[PDB]
Design a protein around this nucleic acid. Structure first.
Length: 40
DNA sequence: TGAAGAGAAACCAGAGTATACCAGTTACTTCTGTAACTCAATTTTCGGGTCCTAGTACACTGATGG
């Protein structure tokens, strides 16, 4: 349990926003552009 | 018996002479690229926040005047 608490502390140190999920919610991890437009 | 030069002891600039820098170039190296795995250090860049000062909307207030 204590080592799990330590690992939780470390994943807190290694945790990270909401702007990244704005208008183009989906986006490449390469280029960072959304998918093409719908037909709608 | 002076005359026209003869000799003599000073200055004075200048032409070789003496330096005095000032470039003029031959080898003889490193340093590129590519490849790779490694690891850490360092930089770049990149999307998003972050704080701050300055207006802005908006419902309400508070008279105000005719």
């Amino acid at each position: 349990q204590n080592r799990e608490q330590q690992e939780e502390l470390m994943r807190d140190l290694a945790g990270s926003y909401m702007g990244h999920f704005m208008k183009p919610y989906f986006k490449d991890k390469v280029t960072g552009v959304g998918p093409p437009a719908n037909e709608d």
